[PDB]
Amino acid sequence: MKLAPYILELLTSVNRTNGTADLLVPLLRELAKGRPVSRTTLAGILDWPAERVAAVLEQATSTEYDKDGNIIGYGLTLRETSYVFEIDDRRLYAWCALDTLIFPALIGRTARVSSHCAATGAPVSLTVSPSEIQAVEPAGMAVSLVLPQEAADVRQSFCCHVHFFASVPTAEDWASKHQGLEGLAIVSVHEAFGLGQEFNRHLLQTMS
Ligand SMILES: [Br-]
């Protein structure tokens, strides 16, 4: 379909908070190691004052901390969700389906991704590398999209409605049952992966 409206609003929501794009990659790479990430550690890595790291993170109100106040989730997370994101043997999680398609390129690793169809509970899995997906099981796997909303934390506006599905027909039936989500649409995981690729492209250009 026409995906420009989705990319454009996702890029905008991200660029709405200055520095987000700059903090994102270095934090995903740290979280990908499997251990909580200190905010002070993050500030050294960005060579930023602690204040700027703080302001960026308090915009993502979904940001997860542990009991020591260390970062344990930002897109990628150490706390179980229904999207499993395995790098090496390390079993990490993602907040949404599209995360699992865009993060491999940002952290430069290949992930073994798994979840369950949000319509039927069926197991889904795929391997996502920085440049391609492989081992798509079942082959017809789909993803839901909605129009990202402006002036709202990204997880809560957009990708809480961004799931995997066993197939496009199964997903379209699920989607017809919902009709109060702006821009609700179903795409193949291949098309989803392409959106992710275009998002990442603009995203990287936005870094300093
Ligand atoms: Br369009």
Swiss-Prot record:
Pfam families: HTH_15, MerB. One of its GO terms (biological process) is response to mercury ion. The keyword Iron does not apply. InterPro entries: MerB, MerB_HTH_dom, MerB_lyase_sf, WH_DNA-bd_sf. Keywords: Lyase, Mercuric resistance, Mercury, Plasmid. Its EC number is 4.99.1.2. GO terms for molecular function: alkylmercury lyase activity. It comes from the Bacteria. It catalyses: an alkylmercury + H(+) = an alkane + Hg(2+). It is an enzyme of class 4 (lyase). Belongs to the MerB family. HAMAP family: MerB. Cleaves the carbon-mercury bond of organomercurials such as phenylmercuric acetate. One product is Hg(2+), which is subsequently detoxified by the mercuric reductase. This is Alkylmercury lyase. It comes from Escherichia coli. The gene is merB.
